[PDB]
Amino acid sequence: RCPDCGSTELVEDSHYSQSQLVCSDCGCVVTEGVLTTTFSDEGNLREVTYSRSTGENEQVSRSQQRGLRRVRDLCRVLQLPPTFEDTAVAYYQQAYRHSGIRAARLQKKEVLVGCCVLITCRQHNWPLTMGAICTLLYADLDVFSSTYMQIVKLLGLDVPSLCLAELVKTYCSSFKLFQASPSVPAKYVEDKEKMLSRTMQLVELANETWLVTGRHPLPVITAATFLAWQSLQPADRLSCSLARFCKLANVDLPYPASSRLQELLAVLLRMAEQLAWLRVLRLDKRSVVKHIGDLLQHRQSLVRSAFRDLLLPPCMLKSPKRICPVPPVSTVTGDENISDSEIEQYLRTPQEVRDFQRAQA
Amino acid sequence: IVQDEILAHRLGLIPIHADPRLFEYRNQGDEEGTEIDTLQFRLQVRCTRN
Amino acid sequence: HECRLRDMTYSAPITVDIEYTRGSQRIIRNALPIGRMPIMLRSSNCVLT
Amino acid sequence: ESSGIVPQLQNIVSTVNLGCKLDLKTIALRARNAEYNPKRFAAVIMRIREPRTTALIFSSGKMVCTGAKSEEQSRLAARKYARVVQKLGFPAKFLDFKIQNMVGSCDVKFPIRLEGLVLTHQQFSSYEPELFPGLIYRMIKPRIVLLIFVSGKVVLTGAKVRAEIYEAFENIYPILKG
Amino acid sequence: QPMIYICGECHTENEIKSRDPIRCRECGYRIMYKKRTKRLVVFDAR
Amino acid sequence: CVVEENDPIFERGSTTTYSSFRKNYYSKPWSNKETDMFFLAISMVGTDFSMIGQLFPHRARIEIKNKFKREEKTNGWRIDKAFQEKRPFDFDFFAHLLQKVLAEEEKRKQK
Amino acid sequence: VMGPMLDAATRKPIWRHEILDADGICSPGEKVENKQVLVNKSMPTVTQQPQYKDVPITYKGATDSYIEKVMISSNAEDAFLIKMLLRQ
Ligand SMILES: [Zn+2]
Ligand SMILES: [Zn+2]
């Protein structure tokens, strides 16, 4: 309030390089002048971080320090920004706060480093495959997933879902069919932008047709990019196989990639049957690759009609007549027991006892 | 691409064939202008491909 | 120009092919990045040349 | 407006104390269906003619009976075990019996978008298809952990009474339907 | 409120909301300029 | 020094790698006569897997446990009949039957 | 970036936030005077509800300047870089 009139219309108005909080009613100067520093003075104040001035970095064990250094090393290897590094170290400290993870196994804390890196990578919508994480973390997928579930159930942090398009782009950037290298001839080299767009359309079709739900996404991504690479030039690539493409691209062939490809080709055949000219052509899983492109031009109505005429595993679409058969309720409890004949037939006879003793002698 | 100020200066440097004896000086202020002491010239050019 | 606009560095990824022994089994790598060298403009590898 | 579907309990787990020390060596030696290996595990595995049942008996008298389908069936199996232990030559008793956990299964008969479900109930759900195809939901009102599959099957666990599983399923049905 | 921008190479009017990855369709250029205002501005020929 | 003892491997693409989650188990299926003699061994011993694994040298105890669980989950009447019937433990004739099973699997491999 | 703080008395932005657009960023084509904000930036003070404090980029200048272009880029750190080109 103003000391003269008591008004609360105090505005900070700088008058010719003079900061001044003055009232807007009577112009009474409430406060004036501000102490800043000067450049040489700024130069001579040295930068000291809270990690040292607050007092932390001293009540830390060598194990926690090794974990932090491993987090930073993996971050720098993956070439993630310093913001990602900071988020990773922060989440690692937050997880270490707990005692169950504090007094854990060496593999446990290694998987903790890995899962903290994974959570930091997910929080920024960045794609990073848990397979490569485990490969660079010196761990196995089983224990990795076990400890991941344990730590997420113990913490309760937000776990954004892995976007499909980002992973698609990340995996398409891996293939070397963009620049003509000595090994790969020019015929296999294809355009990057068009092939990436085709793979994105194919993986969106797969996500909308219930193909990626419940299954690994990377096999579907591989099948989609393979179908795109074959459709961009069906002539020279009609004989190329999935294993041949993987060998040429220097990529580890996923196992279910073949099944995903076979299912996606079946979906494409259904779209062809929906279309007019293709259903008259009577194409197949080998000749629909040249028209895959046309199938994606108006795939909306095609998928709509396909669903009009749900994608489930093959083991469930085998005419499930008796779904979850009702078992006969048997609550017969008698009075309290049945008899002692069953007790006697359960008890081991002396002959069998002696035989087991002779065998395990 | 030409700057607004440079365009305004070039337009001001353009002479007008209007007879000045039939007009008068604008008073202090009065940016709206009056029919006696103001002339309006519109310029609207939209370039497009042939 | 895009680098100047975005306030980033105009560098190229430095890659190398190496060979090491993990468990006495020689394993080789044909392409591994190790750093980034700022590329001079109008150089041999620059996009302007 | 009920859901019209009733889950089916496939496992009933209950701990019960006998109140006396036991000699696992003799228990396993004087029985035919006895499975015990002290270097591997310190519990004797008893199996009976109840429809499905496995008892993990220990030396301190604590035994966990699992695999039953109802609370009454689990109690009958536990009493059967206790009688077998008594006939083996030990003063076993049936004290401190209480249902610890019950696993049930159900089906909704229509697909479920796991991504949409997790986007709608993230704070109560978790979806990691790269690890387990099933989405893991953790509800409190039901007091239950649920594994939901794309095919429409839901496995519920973490309850104490059949009514808890029933009301949890009744509450989760409209969320999955919507 | 539809906020419009222009791409650095495509020069197409793109509409994006707040907190979105700065990108432009049918390309991958990450330079987005703001269109000129529609308000009336007065200039002096001096 | 390694005098050309090993060969270089062109694996581990620096780009990325995926997971497997399945490494070692890779069990081997049973047969009709093998299931019959397995039910016989069940009727003869019980549920103790240690003795079953000791008497079965060529099949693993974990595989035996998996088979027993599968039978308990699918065919309950067969397990009930097995526990109903009983046979005294035979050692010499059991080793003879083991040799017979070895000969049978050898003939199978020949086929 | 907060929107222009409209004055409830006149239903128009205040003299300081007059040059700001609907997104709080000054639009090209207008003139900027002394002690005027170009980006109505607000940053959190925590690093339970976040508490944002305003730190606008005021224009220190004796003479007026005209905004020619306003470039907005996004870095790999999800950081938005805004560059306004003032001309005199
Ligand atoms: Zn005052
Ligand atoms: Zn563009």
UniProtKB/Swiss-Prot annotation, chain A:
Residue ranges of Sequence repeats: 67-152, 168-244
Alphabetic keyword roster: Activator, Metal-binding, Nucleus, Oxidation, Phosphoprotein, Repeat, Stress response, Transcription, Transcription regulation, Zinc, Zinc-finger
Inducing or repressing factors: Down-regulated by epigallocatechin gallate (EGCG) treatment.
Renumbered residue ranges of the record's region Required for interaction with TBP and formation of a ternary complex with DNA and TBP: 319-361
Modifications after synthesis and translation: In response to oxidative stress, Cys-315 is reversibly oxidized to cysteine sulfenic acid. Oxidation of Cys-315 impairs formation of a ternary complex with TBP and DNA and down-regulates expression of target genes in response to oxidative stress.
Recorded consequence of changing residue 315 to D: Impairs formation of a ternary complex with DNA and TBP
One GO BP: transcription preinitiation complex assembly
Sites where the protein binds Zn(2+): 2, 5, 23, 26
Residues modified to Cysteine sulfenic acid (-SOH): 315
Superkingdom of origin organism: Eukaryota
Region (Required for the formation of a ternary complex with DNA and TBP) location: 311-317
Outcome of mutating residue 105 to A: Decreases affinity for DNA
Zinc finger (TFIIB-type): 1-31
Keyword Zinc: yes
Gene Ontology cellular component list: nucleoplasm; nucleus; transcription factor TFIIIB complex; transcription preinitiation complex
Assembly mode: Component of TFIIIB complexes. The TFIIIB complex has two activities, alpha and beta. The TFIIIB-alpha activity complex is composed of TBP, BDP1, and a complex containing both BRF2 and at least four stably associated proteins; this complex inhibits the transcription by pol III via its phosphorylation by CK2; YY1 facilitates the TFIIIB-alpha complex formation. Interacts with TBP; this interaction promotes recruitment of BRF2 to TATA box-containing promoters.
Name by which UniProt lists this protein: Transcription factor IIIB 50 kDa subunit
Origin species: Homo sapiens
Curated annotation (Swiss-Prot), chain E:
Zinc finger regions, C4-type: 7-27
Quaternary structure (record): Component of the RNA polymerase I (Pol I), RNA polymerase II (Pol II) and RNA polymerase III (Pol III) complexes consisting of at least 13, 12 and 17 subunits, respectively. Pol I complex consists of a ten-subunit catalytic core composed of POLR1A/RPA1, POLR1B/RPA2, POLR1C/RPAC1, POLR1D/RPAC2, POLR1H/RPA12, POLR2E/RPABC1, POLR2F/RPABC2, POLR2H/RPABC3, POLR2K/RPABC4 and POLR2L/RPABC5; a mobile stalk subunit POLR1F/RPA43 protruding from the core and additional subunits homologous to general transcription factors POLR1E/RPA49 and POLR1G/RPA34.
UniProt keyword annotations, A-Z: DNA-directed RNA polymerase, Metal-binding, Nucleus, Transcription, Zinc, Zinc-finger
Record keyword Zinc present: yes
A cellular component annotation (GO) from this entry: cytosol
Function: DNA-dependent RNA polymerase catalyzes the transcription of DNA into RNA using the four ribonucleoside triphosphates as substrates. Common component of RNA polymerases I, II and III which synthesize ribosomal RNA precursors, mRNA precursors and many functional non-coding RNAs, and a small RNAs, such as 5S rRNA and tRNAs, respectively.
UniProt protein name: DNA-directed RNA polymerases I, II, and III subunit RPABC4
UniProtKB/Swiss-Prot annotation, chain F:
The Myb-like domain, residue ranges: 22-72
Induction data: By Epstein-Barr virus (EBV) resulting in the stimulation of the EBV EBER genes.
Summary of subunit composition and partner proteins: Component of TFIIIB complex. The TFIIIB complex has two activities, alpha and beta. The TFIIIB-alpha and TFIIIB-beta activities are required for transcription of genes with TFIIIC-bound internal promoters and PSE transcription factor-bound external promoters, respectively. The TFIIIB-alpha activity complex is composed of TBP, BDP1, and a complex containing both BRF2 and at least four stably associated proteins; YY1 facilitates the formation of TFIIIB-alpha activity complex. The TFIIIB-beta activity complex is composed of TBP, BDP1, and BRF1.
Noted disease: Deafness, autosomal recessive, 112: A form of non-syndromic, sensorineural deafness characterized by postlingual progressive hearing impairment. Sensorineural deafness results from damage to the neural receptors of the inner ear, the nerve pathways to the brain, or the area of the brain that receives sound information.
Organism listed in the record: Homo sapiens
Tissue-wise expression: Isoform 2 is highly expressed in cerebellum.
Subcellular location: Nucleus
Modification after translation, per record: Phosphorylated by CSNK2A1 during mitosis, resulting in its release from chromatin and suppression of polymerase III transcription.
This protein's name: Transcription factor TFIIIB component B'' homolog
Protein's gene: BDP1
Curated annotation (Swiss-Prot), chain G:
UniProt-annotated location(s): Nucleus; Cytoplasm, Cytosol
Superkingdom: Eukaryota
Role: Catalytic core component of RNA polymerase III (Pol III), a DNA-dependent RNA polymerase which synthesizes small non-coding RNAs using the four ribonucleoside triphosphates as substrates. Synthesizes 5S rRNA, snRNAs, tRNAs and miRNAs from at least 500 distinct genomic loci. Pol III-mediated transcription cycle proceeds through transcription initiation, transcription elongation and transcription termination stages. During transcription initiation, Pol III is recruited to DNA promoters type I, II or III with the help of general transcription factors and other specific initiation factors.
Similarity comment: Belongs to the RNA polymerase beta chain family.
Name the UniProt record assigns to this protein: DNA-directed RNA polymerase III subunit RPC2
Upper classification of the organism: Eukaryota, Metazoa, Chordata, Craniata, Vertebrata
Gene transcribed to yield this protein: POLR3B
Full-sequence range covered: 790 to 887 of 1133
